[PDB]
Amino acid sequence: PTNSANSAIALRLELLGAPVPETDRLVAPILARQRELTRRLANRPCAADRRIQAFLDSYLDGAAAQPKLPGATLVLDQPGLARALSLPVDATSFTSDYVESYRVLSGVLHNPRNDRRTTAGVFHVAEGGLPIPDDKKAVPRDVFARVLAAAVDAPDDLMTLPWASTQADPARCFVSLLLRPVVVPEVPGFSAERSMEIRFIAPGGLVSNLDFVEGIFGNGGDPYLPENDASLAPESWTGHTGCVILAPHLTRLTKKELGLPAWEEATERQRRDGMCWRGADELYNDGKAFKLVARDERGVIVTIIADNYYGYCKKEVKTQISYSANLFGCVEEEHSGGALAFPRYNLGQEYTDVHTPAGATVERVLARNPGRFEARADGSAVLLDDDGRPDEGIVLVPAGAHFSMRTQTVTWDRREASIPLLADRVYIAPGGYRVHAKHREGDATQWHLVGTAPWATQAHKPATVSGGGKSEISKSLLDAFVFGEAYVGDVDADLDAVQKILDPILSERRSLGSVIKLLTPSSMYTEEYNAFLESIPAHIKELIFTVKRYYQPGWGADWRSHFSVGIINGRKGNSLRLDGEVIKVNMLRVGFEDDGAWRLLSLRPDFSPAAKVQTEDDITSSIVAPGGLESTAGSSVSRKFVTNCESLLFQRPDDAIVRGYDKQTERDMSGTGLFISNYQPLTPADARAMVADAPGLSRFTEPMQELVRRAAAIPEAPREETYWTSTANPRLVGGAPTRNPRYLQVRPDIANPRDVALADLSIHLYRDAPLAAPARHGVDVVAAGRRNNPPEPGVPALCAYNPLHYMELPELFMEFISSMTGKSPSTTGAGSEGALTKSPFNALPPVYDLNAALLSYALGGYDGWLSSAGYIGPKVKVAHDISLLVPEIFSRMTPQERDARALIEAGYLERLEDFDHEGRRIEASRLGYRMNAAFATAYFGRIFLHPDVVFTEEMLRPELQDPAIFADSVEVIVATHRAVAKHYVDDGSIQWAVPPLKALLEIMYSGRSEEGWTLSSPELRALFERENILASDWYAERVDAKVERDRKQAESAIAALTRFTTTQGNEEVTERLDIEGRLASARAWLDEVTSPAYRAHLVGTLGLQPSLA
Amino acid sequence: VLARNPGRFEARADGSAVLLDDDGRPDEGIVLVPAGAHFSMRTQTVTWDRADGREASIPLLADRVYIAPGGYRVHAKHREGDATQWHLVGTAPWATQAHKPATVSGGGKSEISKSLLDAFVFGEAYVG
Ligand SMILES: [Co+2]
């Protein structure tokens, strides 16, 4: 429906009175009637813009101007219009000084004037509002007023809708969009999802930007309807309203003309910020992109962006969401990744279920879910379609069922039943454990069974600097597999030695896993028996498990003759062969040696990557709920729940420049319907050229080749040329390929909804809860990541960390406050992405974020883990090889096992302590605890086959690589803590930090708290304990501020509902929407928020910053 | 207790825990409770305070045995003289083992293990 879209467009422009040039066009002449009954109403702004203008006029009362939001906007009331507006009605390309745009085979492509985001000096904040953070630029209120006035007077080129840009009289208007981005997640017994409202306003030239945000955050509809006025559905809003105005022309204005002072009359701060001029011609922000924010406690945040690169739009929603979170209480916005992981197993050819707990049975499942299943005569059952017919894709089977790839059947007795075992099905037992068949990861011709356990673990990866691998938590481990060989030293000796050990091991009703348990030292084996296991060399065990995996009944004790090594050029070979074919085993790389050689480590032959379902990526909303509720039934401590605010993810495929390497990107970008940016627009001629380069073509994955061939198959041309994009061809900037190629990827839980459905189903069954009930999951483990680097000329050492550190809360928060990186070092230490990595996306005093975060860890009893990315010590490169293992390790440990206290009591974590180096105290105690060789032996044995060679001694103890550098890294850490803490001292923020953080900041800055404490003072450490917080006045003061905010908003809701129900001529809308049924709920709510039961249900939540009540 | 016995218990949200069956399912007959727990036959509940101030509360029932973390047990029973009056019984865990050897007939060798409850007499509280 294309003319469908152009009609919708023509129609709306006509209603706005904008210029215009087929069956539907004729049935709209009663537009021309209502047009002469519209000029009896004056232009009244929507409910959202009314709230925005009220703030702006109050805020700039008696300033140099009180500008007006544009009133004549083309309103994008439906999804899909904005894309259709982005290209000329009659052409496939468009060009302005602001954007080059193209219709491409894979969707739409937009290359903006600037191809990347900046953060240095970009974030500006206006005086007259809440306090400015020390790290931002301070802008006088009069200057803000003038920049806002310039922003609503945009030039004609910029205002020209691309869609009508080729017509005689091109339409020129502001376009605008209502968003309702999520800020408060849903938690079943606890919280309704709530959202703020944002109004995106932009010159018609930049309608691509609206398309951009609408795909990520959804279309909120027509703001002028009371269905979509936020105040009227208070139960689901935060009380807060944001505005974003795109205005790239503002980088032409001078500092003088906006009323900034000359250098001589300027404060030291104004001179630090460049908010003064030595020359009349000095451009504002030196002509570079910026954003200018105004806000205060009233709940309205107004941002102007002087650039149209799509990133800034995304990150301004973020910022505004973060603003709303800070004023709502109880919630946080975070910059974080995450995934819900279910351990998996390679069950071989033959497997009997042994993980259904007694009590769990087909009958009980069926009884708990009336009408969801179709019970079968044999004992199995199948789910029903939403339309009442059975779906054969998912088969519930009895406890103790047996699965056989030899017979291709699932069997059980009760009278033996038997159903087909088929590749396109998933078989699930009554406690939620799944079984399915798949081809081996390296080989489409070999197949085996996979078990998925239902006791998932949800990882959360916050506050992780760039390079730290935030996205890696949810990335797939299967793409990292390397396929190596089974090692043989001397084939006669080794196989003889395998023989001896086999004397029942090759019995077909003894699994591969049990054999591994058999031959792994355990503390419930005779101490003689373990010494025997230690006598078995590493490679002989691997050879046994390999023999086990491939053993056939048919060979019956003459297995030996099926195994060999080749004689390669007269030398006995080192790879075990099965009937002459080299056997292939799965490995992962774990970092690199000093000279850059790969370290490869055999995975266990019963390991399969955990199944992950992404829970977070970049913009995250989170709430902390107390324990003992519906959604926290098994927890004494608070729990954290999350929701991803974005439906599409703005990816930068750095790796896809190399052909064939990034399989996921190449697949996605060969699809359709995508928003694409910073790629080179290619033509069918370019495709024909690339086809004819047969070597180059053959390096693409198949999806991208089909795309190259579709484009090659298109007969030629002018303004209807066909365009396409290639992963190998990012946009040329300065005749070199850009390093910021981009596309909006469909969130992988939305793209693969069967994976979600299966996870949910396993959870319900594991909990014995009905499918009708929601079964929310909260966060189990927090594992942040760090970018570590070796020192270099002009790059400070930051490589003290081993693979995995645990940090108690004070040390954790030094890390979080600092968010340190080797990129952009300061005068005294390292670069900082600011509190929680959110300095570029936080318009408020960062202490509000910090107070909340702290409470979340302490009240939730969450151990702070830190994984290592980049380098471990100066010499060992790791890339993200450890980032990827995190969820696999924690998800295969019980909560009791992975508790930090338990690991310290068993000797699996080792504390770091201060020491002297060249007579200076090195404060290595700030690095917390770290894993040691015993942790590797105890637990990495659940992924890898030789857990003792996984990490070298130098990897576990990076100080052995070079003790000088280790001490240099810790000094860099301490200097960087100081420089960061100084921000809180200079702006007075330190006074608003909660006691444990105030002290922590004081120590970071000067060495001692105000009371004289240091990091090891028991009094300071006691302020971070869960019990002392819950007892404190300051925590009670936050709970009470939250009650008081909620009360005022419930009063502001009652006042808004009434005024509407008693405005002239609103009676028919008032009954249709059951508004007085809402006003009764709003009246019952006010009573509830003031009641004591409500104050008590808030104990164990984050509360609110009292100054913001 | 829980940490010294991995996999033997099922920890509860309220702070209590219960032993697991030979077959992996919880046995409600024995309830581990926190140090400082309060036991009330009037409310028929075991209560204790939480750091958050909520006050936890489980049923106090005659067919159960409640045990604190150092091994001291609490259960309910009818008075020895009267099936209609009930009270709580504490059992301390610091036992003493007696041994009664080389005791001639009439010396009461078996008496060491015989029940003292059968010897109770029920008298009155004296008022002058
Ligand atoms: Co980001």
Q: How far, in Å, from the CA of A477 to the mean position of ligand 1?
A: 22
CB contact under 8 A, B53 and A902: no
DSSP state of A606: T
- Cβ count within 10 A of residue A138: 17
Q: Give the C-alpha distances (Å, rounded to integers) separating A904 from A658, A786, A832, A867, B5.
A: 44, 22, 31, 18, 17
Tell me the CA end-to-end span of chain A in Å, nearest whole number. 50
Distance CA(A610)–CA(A434), nearest Å, equals 12
Asked whether the beta carbons of residue A627 and residue B6 sit closer than 8 angstroms, the reply is: no
In sequence order, the 6+-apart residues with CB closer than 8 A to the CB of A757 are none
Comparing CA positions, the residue from A285, A244, A275, A278 lying closest to residue A264 is A278
Paired sense of beta strands A137-139 and A174-179, if any: unpaired
Q: Is B33 helix (H, G, I), strand (E, B) or coil?
A: coil
Contact A357 B25 (CB under 8 A): yes
Contact at CB, A1027 and B25, closer than 8 angstroms:
no
Angle of helix A846-860 relative to helix A310-328, nearest 10 degrees, comes to 60
Q: DSSP letter at A547? A: H
Cα–Cα distance for residue pair A2/A114, rounded to 1 Å: 30
- Spell out a b/e string for A896-926, using b for 16 or more CB atoms within 10 Å of the CB, else e: eebebebbeeeebbbebeeeeeeeeebbbeb
Contacts of A1026 in chain B (CB under 8 A): 51
Q: Do residues B95 and B101 touch, judged by C-beta distance below 8 A?
A: no
Instruction: Report the b/e string of A26-65 with b at 16+ CB within 10 A.
Output: eeeeeeeeeeeeeeeeeeebbbbbebbbebbeebbeebee
Query: What does the alpha-carbon distance between residue A347 and residue A875 come to, in Å, rounded to a whole number?
Result: 39
- Are A628 and B54 inside 8 Å of each other by CB? yes
Gap between the terminal Cα atoms of chain B = 52
DSSP string, A863-924: -EEEEEEEEETTTEEEETTTTTTHHHHHTTS-HHHH-HHHHHHTTSEEE---EEETTEEE-G
Experimental method: X-ray
Of the candidates A71, A235, A35, the residue with the CA atom closest to the CA atom of residue A1088: A235
Which chain B residues are within 8 Å of A1099, Cβ to Cβ? 52-54
Ion ligand 1 contact residues with beta carbon within 5 A: A 618
Q: Where are the alpha helices (DSSP H) in A940-1032?
A: 953-956, 963-986, 995-1006, 1018-1022, 1026-1031
Q: Are A238 and A623 in contact (CB under 8 A)?
A: no
Q: Where are the alpha helices (DSSP H) in A776-898?
A: 809-818, 846-860, 886-890, 895-898
Closest CA to A346 of A610, A547, A584, A606: A606
CB A240 within 8 A of CB A299: yes
Question: Across-strand partners of A674?
Answer: A107
* Backbone phi, psi, residue A572, to 5°: -55, 135
Cβ contact A628:A637 at 8 Å: no
Among the listed residues A864, A898, A902, A878, the one whose alpha carbon sits nearest the alpha carbon of residue A958: A878
- Containing A6, the helix (H) or strand (E) segment is helix A2-16
Please report where in the chains the tokens 């209480």 appear, as a residue.
A329
- Find the B94 Cα to ligand 1 centroid distance in Å: 60
Q: Name every residue in A having a CB less than 8 A away from some CB of B.
A: 357-359, 626-628, 632-636, 894, 896-897, 901-902, 905, 1026-1027, 1030-1031, 1096, 1099-1100
Helix (H) or strand (E) holding A212: helix A208-217
- Of all residues in chain B, what percent are helix, strand and coil, respectively (each to 5)? 5, 35, 60
Specify the residue for token string 């591969």.
A512
With an 8 Å Cβ cutoff, are A902 and B23 in contact? no
Closest by alpha carbon to A774, among A193, A143, A91?
Answer: A193
CA distance B75 to A1056: 59
Amino acid letter, A1064: Q
Q: Number of residue pairs across A and B with CB atoms under 8 Å?
A: 41
Asked whether the beta carbons of A945 and A515 are under 8 A apart, the reply is: no
Alpha helices in A502-569 (DSSP H): 512-518, 527-535, 538-550
Please name the residue of chain B whose CA is at the shortest distance from the CA of residue A1099: B52
Kindly provide the b/e burial profile for residues A211-220, where b requires at least 16 CB atoms within 10 angstroms of the residue's own CB.
bbbbbbbbbb
Coil, helix or strand at residue A113: coil
Cα dihedral A388, A393, A399, A403, rounded to 10, equals 150
Q: How far is the CA of A379 from the centre of ligand 1 (A)?
A: 50
Residue A567: beta bridge partners? A572
Contact A635 B6 (CB under 8 A): no
**Chain-chain contact of B25 with A1100 (C-beta, under 8 angstroms):** no
Task: Report the alpha-carbon angle A88-A90-A92, nearest 5.
Answer: 65
Q: CB under 8 Å to A859, separation ≥6 — which residues?
A: A624, A637, A638, A1026, A1029, A1030, A1100, A1101, A1102
Chain B residues with CB within 8 Å of chain A CB: 2-3, 6, 11-15, 23-25, 50-54
CA angle A186, A386, A181 (to 5 degrees): 25
- Give alpha helix (H) positions in A248-402: 268-272, 310-328, 362-368
Look at residues A1086, A1076, A1087 and name the one whose alpha carbon lies nearest to residue A232. Answer: A1076
